[PDB]
Amino acid sequence: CTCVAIIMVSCVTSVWLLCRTRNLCITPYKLAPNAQVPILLALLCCIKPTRA
């Protein structure tokens, strides 16, 4: 019961910092939809594909 608490806390903390990294991927680029997008930051580091 102590071992499943470590595997639950560290799971929801590592994906919490990953969700912050996912969120900060976009707000440089959702603010200017006319700007072009590199192919490295589209699918490798972040999730958003090319749209519009």
């Binding site: 900060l24 976009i26 707000t27 440089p28 680029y29 959702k30 603010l31 200017a32 939809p33 006319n34 700007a35 072009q36």
Partner: protein
Amino acid sequence: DKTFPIMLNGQVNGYACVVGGRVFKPLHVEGRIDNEQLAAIKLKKASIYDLEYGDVPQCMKSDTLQYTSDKPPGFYNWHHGAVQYENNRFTVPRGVGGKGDSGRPILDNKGRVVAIVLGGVNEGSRTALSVVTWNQKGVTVKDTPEGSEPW
């Protein structure tokens, strides 16, 4: 142009602007927009990059267009006057620099918005403005000079 202000108990303390595809609102003010179509939108908070949500449909969208690349240090228009500066913001005289002027857009000669002010009350003989802009390749950055109070 279209730039609706922000109300709080009658007095004017903030301004909200509409760009192509989105709406903006500064975080240094609290209040409700008097427009009913602009009040039911889920405005989500963000960092200093100032991400908001333009959930309004197309039929009133794109009152003005955001500025492209190739920014000179030439003439730029302003609600109280004019500014001629690209790296920093111009040393405008007094009068402008009061309270509640946050969110007023800075436009070019061709009616295209360049920067949105957020601070810089009074910095002596030369007054600077803390604005957001796109630095070199369209990435939206925030510029703040030294000692910039929230204005």
